[PDB]
Structure 1
């Protein structure tokens, strides 16, 4: 196959090259040649992610749910979990604002059902038959239940019976790996990403004209200017109130951010994140505990990412978001960020989750396309997103080591 190139560039080629080929066929050779000979390669890519969604959702959430479970942790974690909870919680609230002062999707307009009298949906979050729910789509209850199980398991491990203790581990580990196996396919999909994305954005550059680019960069801005604002108004702020020098903090994390920015793998940048921790005076039994938990949990760069991407979709349909469903985003996107893997694609797919909630199924055509536009450019947003995901751990690690 001879296709050995470094993924990031290898894809950033198919993005810029795919744009132009789309525009040169925006005029000239018209719109029916692409909608038949290029996009069929796009859908494939997307549907390979679709594929992954339900199992990853399920498995990831259980593995996540068994990793947190209170109280299966020392109070050394309590300070940082609360930190993780609130650094992620406010992150998406900021994402709302970036989706408020910037309105991406509104003007790109290219139909959903009502809500029952609150009773049913608050009940509907509870599955009827776990299998049947997990079977065909329906994400919302899949969450609820999966968690309830992930918790149950941890309490089988502390049960006095040895076989019961044994039953817990094995089962959990079966879901784990099932978890992990998924990701090697996600990476197996990211090898198809260059040929995949090329076809996608190519279709979106042929139809809809150039108005897309004026909105794509309007998303990308709303995101990146929210990202740095997070660092400046949250990190830089909470660094000052605890006596830590915020300028030299960045100089010590210089390698930890920039290696994470390029690789886009928070779970892969961890030894680099651990190496930086020692270089600025953080205790052993402190950073060997927080960083391995920050590698999976606390994904504020993603939590925000989804909170915006949603508004995009909403406005790209021309649907106005209500409060009650707006405060659902923040409730979901967090649970979504806590679920996310810490790998190239991860976030994008977890977005699907924060979409099936609020009444936006991916089986619907208008969702497919609009989502695929985010998915095409995902790679760009992904880089900065990761960079912030890693900063959130070290800042918390430097903060929790102050009051200990």
Structure 2
């Protein structure tokens, strides 16, 4: 409780809890009595997970309403077309590379990391037609509460475009009312951010508890796959950086070395801060240094940062393959491309704050193939959750660099 605790700024603090916990969990004989560590520690971690889920739902709604309504109807045009194409193609290629890398490493298992035995293939997922139908909400509040992310996305975009056509109308009462509504929702969003900042400080203890249980449960071989898949992701990320950007910058006429030189400044703050939003003003400064047009970067940067996320999509595909191979599941081609589409939609919906990235994974699993209710699935989810902390660090810099690439390419064409 003592203030100095909250005064230590180092995000390295989290890693402290990562290390100190694992050691204790690693010591099976004198400390790692599975039953006692289980009963005592597990709830401290479930508390962190439970708290983490709370942040997700309203942030999506408020951020999308404000951003879409303020940004898109105003500038809507061919610039929007090129940007949308770029973002969607990048998401697709990112998930493609994640799949290819899971094929290359095969990180998931040497022997089934979950106990298997009841790995029997899951209940068949619905065909694509009903998935696409679901994207539109059968009822807004009913689907909002129950626990569905995407239809809230739809409804929010709708409401925002509506308001934006609205405020321009003549009658003053209408303009005033719309303004008040918008401001209220924006205030809600700011509040949720302020809460995120706080939760981050409790996070370390939860990391400590979760990883301690993970280590003490299975012991030595949980770290064999864990690092393997870890590297599988990191390489998969670097490739995305090298091939995608160097090609594009090369094609349109920027020498990539100087580009990354310039970006390193923002990438440092993205990696260590573990958050995408605060970098956005740093991104605007970097663009002003990069030689990019004001209206274009002012339109694109917020919209890209909220909408477009590629590194997280690769992380989700690779984590999905991890789960599948740990459970004792093997994925057919149709299921693979279905994962492609579903992960595209999930990366689109993703929130944009540190931990949220894991949560949307639960969506893809539920949308296709493996349901979450099977205990082995949650068991492996627990293993993922720990390393997610470090993986997010590189995912942040990847996403920011991709958005910068998009804006600089568009501006260079014009």
Q: Same fold (TM over 0.5)?
A: yes
Rate the CA distance shift 1:299–1:140 in 2: closer, same or farther, 3 A. Answer: closer
Q: Distance in 2 between matches of 1:67 and 1:380?
A: 34
After superposition, what is the alpha-carbon deviation per residue over 1:148-207, rounded to whole angstroms, capped at 9, x for unaligned?
444544444455554444444443444434334333333322211110010001111011
Q: Secondary structure at the match of 1:380?
A: helix
Q: Is the CA contact (8 Å cut-off) linking 1:60 and 1:339 kept in structure 2? A: no
**8 Å Cα contact 2:55/2:192 also seen in 1:** yes
Segments of 5+ residues of structure 2 without an aligned counterpart are: 114-120
How many angstroms apart in 1 are the aligned matches of 2:300 and 2:354? 22
1:236, CA displacement in angstroms? 0.8
Q: Aligned to 2:297, which of 287, 293, 296?
A: 287
Whether the 8 Å CA contact 2:14–2:203 is kept in 1: the answer is yes
Q: Which runs of 5+ in 1 are unaligned?
A: none
Deviation at 1:141, TM superposition (A): 4.3
> Cα distance 1:219–1:170, how it changes in 2: closer, same or farther (>3 A)?
farther
Tell me, yes or no, if the aligned pair for 1:7 and 1:190 is still in contact at 8 Å.
no
The C-alpha deviation readout for 1:111-131, integer Å capped at 9, x for no partner, is 742234665544444443332
1:235, 1:312 → 2: CA distance? Answer: 27
> 1:333 Cα shift?
2.8
Q: 2:104 aligns with which of 87, 98, 101?
A: 101
Bigger mean CA offset, 90-99 vs 337-346: 337-346
Counterpart Cα distance in 2 of 1:181 and 1:253: 30
What SS class does the counterpart of residue 144 from structure 1 fall into? helix
- Across the aligned residues of Structure 1 and Structure 2, the Cα RMSD in angstroms comes to 2.9
Paired with 2:391 and 2:128, the residues of 1 have a C-alpha distance of 35
The answer to whether the 8 A contact 2:153-2:349 is kept is: no
- Cα deviation digits, residues 270-293 of structure 1 (max 9, x gap): 232222223333333333333333
Further displaced range: 36-45 or 286-295: 286-295
The number of equivalent residue pairs is: 404
Alpha-carbon shift at residue 386 of structure 1 (Å): 0.8
Cα distance in 1 for residues equivalent to 2:328 and 2:59? 30
Partner SS state of residue 73, structure 2: coil
Q: Counterparts of 1:307 and 1:151 in 2: how far apart (Å)?
A: 32
Worse-matched range after superposition: 243-252 or 127-136: 127-136
Q: Label 1:264 to 1:285 Cα distance change in 2 as closer, same or farther (>3 A).
A: same
Q: CA deviation at 1:402?
A: 1.4
For the 8 Å contact 1:26–1:205, the answer to whether it is kept is no
Shift of 1:342: 3.4
Whole-Å separation in 2 of the counterparts to 1:372 and 1:266: 24
| Contact 1:108–1:211 (Cα < 8 Å) also in 2 | no
- Residues 14 and 162 of structure 1: CA distance in aligned 2, closer, same or farther (over 3 Å): same
Distance 1:72 1:283 in 2: 14
Query: Displacement of 1:370 after TM fit?
Result: 2.2
Q: For the structure 1 residues 287 and 104, does the alpha-carbon distance in structure 2 shift closer, same or farther, using more than 3 Å as the test? A: same
Aligned-residue offset at 1:42: 0.8
| Distance (Å, rounded) in 2 between the aligned partners of 1:109 and 1:373 | 14
Residues 308 and 146 of structure 1: CA distance in aligned 2, closer, same or farther (over 3 Å): farther
Q: Is the 8 A contact 2:125 2:367 kept in 1?
A: no
TM-score by length of 1: 0.88
1:140·1:357 contact (CA, 8 Å) conserved in 2?
no
Q: Please tell me whether the aligned partners of residues 7 and 191 of structure 1 are also in contact (alpha carbons under 8 angstroms).
A: no
Q: CA deviation digits over 1:79-134, x for unaligned, max 9?
A: 33322232233112211212222223334646742234665544444443332222
Correspondence for 1:41: 44
**Residues 1:147 and 1:41: Cα distance change in structure 2 (over 3 Å):** same
What are the superposed Cα offsets for residues 224-257 of structure 1, whole Å, 9 maximum, x if unpaired? 1011100111111111111111111111212121
Aligned partners of 2:214 and 2:382 also within 8 Å:
no
Deviates more, 1:3-12 or 1:195-204: 3-12
CA offsets, 1:36-90, max 9 Å, x none?
1111111111111223333334444444554665685243443333222322331
| Partner SS for 2:123 | coil
Contact 1:26 1:206 (8 Å CA) reproduced: no
* Change in 2 beyond 3 A, CA 1:95/1:262: same
Deviates more, 1:44-53 or 1:81-90: 81-90
Distance 2:362 2:64 in 1: 14
Cα distance change on mapping 1:118 and 1:87 into 2, 3 Å: closer
